[PDB]
Amino acid sequence: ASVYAWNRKRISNCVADYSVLYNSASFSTFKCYGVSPTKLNDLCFTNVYA
């Protein structure tokens, strides 16, 4: 979607492998703010939104 009508998808009830996101070189910017990128596999979350 366009940026004025940006699409919000709920992520819930899943096990997430962020290591395929860290190890992929396709992303020009992979920058996390309130959490380390390598600790994402060690934590549990709710209210995940893309």
Partner: protein, 49 residues
């Protein structure tokens, strides 16, 4: 320490960075002191083939 990398990978030669050559090729410590030097070498380290 001399090496050749890409143009977008020069941000990863720094303390406290997350990245690819930082993890598996060349890591700088968090208490690193010194200077990192980078310049473009497309005229020398590149071939048309």
């Amino acid at each position: 320490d001399s090496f050749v990398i890409r143009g977008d990978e020069v941000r990863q030669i720094a303390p406290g960075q997350t990245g690819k050559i930082a993890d598996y090729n060349y890591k700088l410590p968090d208490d690193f002191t010194g200077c990192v030097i980078a310049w473009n070498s497309n005229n020398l380290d590149s071939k048309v083939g």
